[PDB]
Design a protein around this ligand. Sequence first.
Ligand code: 87D
Length: 111
Amino acid sequence: GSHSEQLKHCNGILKELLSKKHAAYAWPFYKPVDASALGLHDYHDIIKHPMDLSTVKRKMENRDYRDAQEFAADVRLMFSNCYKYNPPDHDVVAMARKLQDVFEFRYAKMP
Ligand SMILES: COc1cc(=O)n(C)cc1-c1cc(NS(C)(=O)=O)ccc1Oc1ccccc1
């Protein structure tokens, strides 16, 4: 209903995205993409605004999100970056779709 009640609900969503239940498809999103280590050609030229769950967690922990909409935008940016950069048949795209299914359903249940 209110900003704080909506933010509490978003903290609940983040907790689920970082739970053991979803870890089999969430782990590539736990930390920022390390383009050098992975040999991700032109990653930082194609992706202007990198995002990952550790960044979303740091922002939630410090109360940096003013509303639920800011939180949604960051999570969605993380999935959108993954779809934009990677080939459609890469395993990480399938993991991203799986985690996003979890996010979208819980975010839609926000009162
Ligand atoms: C191309 O890999 C990615 C592309 C991408 O858009 N995202 C968000 C994440 C990855 C990714 C990142 C790391 N390690 S990391 C966080 O950079 O330290 C490890 C595995 C990763 O995915 C893989 C999944 C299955 C097979 C191969 C890779």
